[model samples]
Target: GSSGSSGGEKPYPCEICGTRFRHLQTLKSHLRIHTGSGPSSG
Candidate 1:
């Protein structure tokens, strides 16, 4: 049966900026933008 669900709005949250994502991968991709403070001299 094609049913539905409730309270399924971006359960995965980015506490860093009060942001949220529906999928974990989605969040992870964007997460790098904010967490790209690493060493890279190229």
Candidate 2:
């Protein structure tokens, strides 16, 4: 396994809102809210 640590990594970023997230998945979920693409049941 390639083990490397990131001291400073901005993985998730919203260019439209200048928002940043630690994980890419979180950012993807956030993007859905902006476009009203998220499930209504959420």
Candidate 3:
């Protein structure tokens, strides 16, 4: 059986930047960068 499924993964989407990620966590982390909240004391 295939471990990966088309609907099993969490699809990440960014409407503003037109970006997509496989995991939601990754998308959240990426969003922080755009909001100026990543890797800096903002």
Q: Against the true structure, whose lDDT is highest?
A: 1
TM-score against truth, every candidate: 0.55, 0.49, 0.49
Candidate 2 local lDDT, 4-33, one digit each (tens) = 333467455665574777776787777766
- Which residue pairs in model 1 clash with each other? none
Q: Comparing 1 and 2 by lDDT, which wins?
A: 1
Clashes of each: 0, 0, 0
Give the least accurate 10-residue stretch of model 2, judged by summed lDDT: 2-11
Worst 10 residues of 3 by lDDT: 1-10
lDDT of 2: 0.62
lDDT of 1 by residue, 1-42 (tens): 432322588777775674778876797776666765567321
Candidate whose TM-score is highest: 1
Q: Return the lDDT, model 2, position 42.
A: 56
Which residue pairs come into collision in candidate 3? none
> What does the lDDT come to for candidate 3?
0.61
Per-residue lDDT value at 13 in model 2 = 65
